[PDB]
Write a structure and sequence with these properties.
Four copies of one chain form a homotetramer. Chain A has eight helices and 17 strands. The first copy, chain A, has helices at about 35-40, 65-80, 95-105, 130-140, 230-235, 255-265, 295-310, 315-324, and strands spanning about 5-10, 15, 25-30, 50-55, 85-90, 110-115, 150-155, 155-160, 165, 175, 185, 190, 195, 215-220, 240-245, 270-275, 290. In chain A, the strands form four sheets. An eight-stranded mixed beta sheet of chain A has the order 4-1-5-6-7-8-11-12, sandwiched between helices. A four-stranded parallel beta sheet of chain A has the order 14-15-16-17, sandwiched between helices. A two-stranded antiparallel sheet of chain A has the order 2-3. In chain A, helix 2 (about 65-80) packs across helix 3 and helix 5 (about 230-235) runs parallel beside helix 6 (about 255-265). Chain A is globular and about 60 Å long. Chains in contact: A-B, A-C, A-D, B-C, B-D, C-D. The complex binds aspartic acid (4 copies). One aspartic acid (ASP) binds near residues 11, 92 and 93 of chain C. It is classed as hydrolase. Keywords: L-asparaginase, Erwinia chrysanthemum, E63Q mutation, Aspartic acid, hydrolase. The assembly is tetrameric.
Chain lengths: ~325, ~325, ~325, ~325
Amino acid sequence: LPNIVILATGGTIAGSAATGTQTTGYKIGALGVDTLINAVPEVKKLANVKGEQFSNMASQNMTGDVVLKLSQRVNELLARDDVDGVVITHGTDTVEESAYFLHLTVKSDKPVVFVAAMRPATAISADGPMNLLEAVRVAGDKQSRGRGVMVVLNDRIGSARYITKTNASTLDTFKANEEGYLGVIIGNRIYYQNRIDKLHTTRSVFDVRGLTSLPKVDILYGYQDDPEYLYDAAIQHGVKGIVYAGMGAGSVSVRGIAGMRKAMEKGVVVIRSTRTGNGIVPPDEELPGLVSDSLNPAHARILLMLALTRTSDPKVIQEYFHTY
Amino acid sequence: LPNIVILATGGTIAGSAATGTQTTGYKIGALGVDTLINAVPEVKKLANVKGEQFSNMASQNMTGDVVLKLSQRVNELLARDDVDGVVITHGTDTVEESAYFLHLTVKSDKPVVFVAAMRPATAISADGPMNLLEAVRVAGDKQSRGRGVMVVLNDRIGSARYITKTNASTLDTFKANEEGYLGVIIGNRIYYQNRIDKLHTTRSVFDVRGLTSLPKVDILYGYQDDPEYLYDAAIQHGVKGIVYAGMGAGSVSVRGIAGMRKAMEKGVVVIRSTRTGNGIVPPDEELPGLVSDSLNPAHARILLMLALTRTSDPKVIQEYFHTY
Amino acid sequence: LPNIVILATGGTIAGSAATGTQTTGYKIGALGVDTLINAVPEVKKLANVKGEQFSNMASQNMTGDVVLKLSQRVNELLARDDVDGVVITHGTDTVEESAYFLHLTVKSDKPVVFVAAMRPATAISADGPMNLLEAVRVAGDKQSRGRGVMVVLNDRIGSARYITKTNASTLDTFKANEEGYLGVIIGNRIYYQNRIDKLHTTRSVFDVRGLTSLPKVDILYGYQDDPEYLYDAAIQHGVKGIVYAGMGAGSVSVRGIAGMRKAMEKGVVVIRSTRTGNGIVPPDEELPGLVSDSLNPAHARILLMLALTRTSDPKVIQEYFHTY
Amino acid sequence: LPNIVILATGGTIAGSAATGTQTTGYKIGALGVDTLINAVPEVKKLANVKGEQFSNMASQNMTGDVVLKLSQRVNELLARDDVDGVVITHGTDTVEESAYFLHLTVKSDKPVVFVAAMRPATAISADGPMNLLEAVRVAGDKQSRGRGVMVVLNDRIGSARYITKTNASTLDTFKANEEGYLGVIIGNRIYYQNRIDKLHTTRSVFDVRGLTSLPKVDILYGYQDDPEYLYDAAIQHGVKGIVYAGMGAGSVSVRGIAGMRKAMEKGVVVIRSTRTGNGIVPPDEELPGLVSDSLNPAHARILLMLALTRTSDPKVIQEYFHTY
Ligand SMILES: N[C@@H](CC(=O)O)C(=O)O
Ligand SMILES: N[C@@H](CC(=O)O)C(=O)O
Ligand SMILES: N[C@@H](CC(=O)O)C(=O)O
Ligand SMILES: N[C@@H](CC(=O)O)C(=O)O
């Protein structure tokens, strides 16, 4: 059997409430990894599992300094001969951010599979148990190697690059509308469908193994009447990058243009993404900033932060956005 | 034939470039309403049409003060016996905002149909000509009365309350994933599917006739490492409301909580929405602010601006979010 | 509390296996309604429930003669003052067919809510317990009245007329891509979004309480090299109707045309639907047969079968396909 | 510039009508390939194009004998040093079938791109011109090689193996809900997203060069009261294979089981697929026949027909369904 580490970080998957129908005020923070494992003892027939408690927080509170440590720990685990893959339990709210950070920074072809749940562990028809079992199946299959970092919920295997939480509250929220899933897990069998045509993991230039902090990057929203003062505030607080969740295809109002021009004069890198949820922001030399290709705001922030650890060259950063 | 006013505001539907393949740097601002009409002379068999040029701007520059004037003008038109319906040509980037605003403020059951195009008028396979024909058909049909404000592109009829631009760049971008379309237009026939189960138009409390300005509302994004100082800046600049484009189901970090509590202390109403794109932000009394129900951030800002013209009572605002 | 009858018919929702991971060869037929109810005792806080075993079969084996009895039983139940609504447990494979039959023939505004599960009751993370809770919530809510027949799974409420099983094997399979959900159930709360703009239940002409047999209607697929001899076979076996699951918008090959013409010569009513999954088959006088509007093949067969109990006039049948 | 051959087969892309709004009774058969090319002279900046007229039919009339000749012609063209790629204009109704056939039988890594249109060439906002331009851009790009056969409409690049016509009548009908698109074309730029993880073209065992006919395979629908006599009829008429468009996950009624057992006794290979539109039909040793993995009925028919040119060994055929 393959040797799989289950690295727990918190989330609703490790949430507990006093009744099976409670959806608010459940606690995250007191349910440990061994309790998740013991709730699905069937995982032991798929892998020799070892639980490790990395953190126990609601993912809305996950921070880049912590994600950096998570990436470094995973890289340490995967460098060992006795570890074949890692499953990371996490909250759904920012799993796409953590997963994509690891997607770019893990220097191994061994599987890294993020898993989460929309319903607490105590809920009627809680999704975490099956999601965990699926995640371990994926992480322990030799065919899963070399595919980049994965996010597994609800019988689906999503690439960290494309998958996003699309719905506030449903079980089937993780989707990649235009890019689909890498694979699905049905009837205890994995069906691989796609390989992402982007750079990741062992073919990625990003390396944060020796680093202790990351560039500050903020996200500003685009909408009617959007204010210029938010750009001033960001600049004043020392951002190195701004991701713009733009109207449409990264379209910018007269106020946003003024703000972006100010940020650029101070050396801030501006990436124009979209608030829409999907699709390409195309290049446009008449507008300020670089373009996010098909990276959503949350993903674009992660790529920009990592880009800034190794370059300041806008041509290179723009190429990263087209290739990662 | 029905009498329809085509009230033009700008957008890529009135955009023009020197070649049929140009997708950036096309111009908006020089193509008038009568040129759109004359490009589809078939429209004169569907309705007696009259063009009126309201504005000629890219919709990323549309502002609340202008949308207020647009609502006021549409109400004046619809009050006339010689107007059966109004089609409004608009940019796609913020049509959902303008349309939702009219949805809540137009005091007539006569159809109001926003129309837009993703490709400029000069493009190969431009979508605007057919979109416009479909919009005029929808606006003139008796079956279209009392449906709320509508957004028509790509053979679909979306309710202003549910429809959103879901993709930066595709023809099929307007979708309501969980709510579907009010109807479709196929083979020159309208097929109505649904009537929205929400308050609007003639049953709405909101009335902005005689207002000249609207309460200031900003939108802040939720993400890992989101900063408290953006809430400070908003407060400092006199916002009356903040809509939060939250992680997941309106989930808030420790930093966002601190910012939100500060804002509330200053009398700012906070609405927690979601960055996800879809779904319900459920109530949770322990967290700060009110919840957006299924309203996305852009829609929630419109509803909140209008709510603030009438009340500061959180109970009443929250009920508006569940009913409009 | 409302009074709800849970009328059980079988399905995977009532399926059982000896382990939590078994997805094939689980048994349907030996898990009774009271076993479903006692697995979610929380239901008793939502309603006073009474279980009634109507049948215990896999739904691929459900037949129109049995559906007719189901409809008759539900009408008896809903005519009682001590019954506020009915939840029907059913297999997912043909729930859309049973549900739409009831949608057209139940002569009450009281809620009728079909529920099903994609995982057996014994499965890890089985969906049926929460689905059943949600269905009883919907059936017991006074706001659920007058909506037509509903199908509830995975936190969604679909209209029988629009919902379909879109995926062989996933929890989120039930969707209505173009028409959306009537509502959703999140955080123990119902959010109604739409009302269907079609005739049903108390405004439907179909009444089968005195119906003594059902007309025979077959469905034939359209594809390259489709054979004429299947139409011959259908005609020879006495079908009264054929639903064609056509290529595209009910497009017919030269062979299909020959078959359809033959069928019509013999008095068989032909409806051209689509194999695509969604959308409108528009009228086309140059082709044989009537058109299905937006009814998929399974739904079109149900409506045709009912229509044939009342009329053989193609103009009347065609108008039923545009209004129901 | 690359050398691209446009090989025309017919379809609505080559349809013509007397007015721009006519959606029925337009003619296919009178617009030649040069007329398509001359409608988009911009194409000549993308490629050196040569048109060849293979056929001029509505695709609902396309047959396996003709597709076999199309595949043979494409293989001849791609064997030339002076041909860099081929674009094939085709009707939308059965493009998925012709494309998948070629996906399995073209013995080159040079791009083969099918293109189609939902509106006739004469329509207001006809989609064919831009679709054709996009197809030529894709076929001419060196990065397009080795990707399998592609289907291009509406700014999307779909794999022949996953793409299907999902809606009877809309421009955005071609989708792969679970698998996404191989890429997209926005702003005159190609964005590749995925490589399919299936065998195709140069890695495929199939070579039909030299064959003039194919094994007979019919598709039978699954539904409530489905009849055994359609199985009898197919067997009687000499089918070598039956694809079942099953209820749910290839679920079979007692009548379908009887028919399938009869067919298998006569040496007919039965594949259980799904009518649902998407997803996996899993193995089940208790049911008759092989399973279609995620192949929909139309695609499963093509693979089975090809498989039958080489083998009747169910173990091999089943592996093919999992790998092609
Ligand atoms: N707030 C939780 C939500 C979840 O995990 O479903 C988290 O992200 O930690
Ligand atoms: N920026 C344009 C985009 C469009 O109309 O498609 C607008 O919103 O005015
Ligand atoms: N064959 C089962 C499938 C399910 O219920 O999910 C049924 O329809 O009865
Ligand atoms: N019947 C046409 C439809 C189209 O091309 O859109 C065809 O498949 O040839």
